[PDB]
Amino acid sequence: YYTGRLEYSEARRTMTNALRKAPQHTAVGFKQTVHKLLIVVELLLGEIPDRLQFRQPSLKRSLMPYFLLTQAVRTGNLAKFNQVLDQFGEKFQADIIRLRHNVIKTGVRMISLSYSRISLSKEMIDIYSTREPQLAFHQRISFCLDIHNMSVKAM
Amino acid sequence: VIDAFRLINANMMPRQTTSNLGHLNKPSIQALIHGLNRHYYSITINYRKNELEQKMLLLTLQDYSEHCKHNESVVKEMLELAKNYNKAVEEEDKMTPEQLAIKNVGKQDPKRHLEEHVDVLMTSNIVQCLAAM
Amino acid sequence: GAEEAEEVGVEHLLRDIKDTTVGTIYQLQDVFNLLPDVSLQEFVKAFYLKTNDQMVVVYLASLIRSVVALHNLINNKIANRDAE
């Protein structure tokens, strides 16, 4: 975790390695900011709704600002992300283009009115596939089971 | 089962052997056999062979119906056999003793079936498919 | 062949190093008529797809054997834990 305290390629695997040793450890300092800080960085890469809000009631460790910025990107406009940023201002962890990136993932349709509007080789669009597209994800779980062998070497 | 013998019809009257050869103090020691072994006295059977003889003795199918209808099959038994594995782990978690009543000789067999099913496809749904590549 | 019903006089004769280890112009003109395939539009897409589907199958599996392997882990750990 202290190595977790820039790059975002491995902050989540060090988040899995980080969020392990705290049955009941502290109430300030060590136990607190690892979870909420690392899931904030997990939004600094851009990971949105479905691990966020129902995973909150385990900690509930003063719980205002970072969750508020998570839905401030989950919606994704600068107008109320402003008052998340400037009106709070003490939230710390100071170290904008990402909530821009969310709304322009849509487009109006694709081009957006002859290359110009605002919101505020596999001819398919990226659904699934039976070639190189889905193969990457496939060999994810295979790798996991192989790495899970370690279990057999423990008795 | 090969064994030669002697003429010990008569002559109950040398061969250090390293202590009587071993494996004829272990026959199937049965009285009519050992009473026959009074006359018999087997000794050994050696064996020869050559490398030549030794050495001498020593695809596809893809979606015909094949790949589908042996992963359309086995995943269904993984479904409801994993439901019976759920029932096994729920059930034997408590009130279990004496090696699960001797491994359920009756209603054989939950869990192992899942292991066998897992083994069957991962030798097939990879390997020759691998050679497809 | 297979040597049916008399492989007893073969499997006794298959000692040192064992079976596996046990314990471990017209015709050639018509040869290259059926060779060429890099045309990935259709065929390529199909090949991609099948691989994905079978890969998935393996991922599904390589999971339930990991689970039952973990069940053997907790069996051994509670066994030697009770042998403490």
């Binding site: 193969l135 | 691998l130 590549m133 | 691989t51």
Partner: peptide, 8 residues
């Protein structure tokens, strides 16, 4: 993926 394609 032939290189990529531990189980034993």
């Amino acid at each position: 993926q032939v290189i990529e394609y531990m189980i034993v």
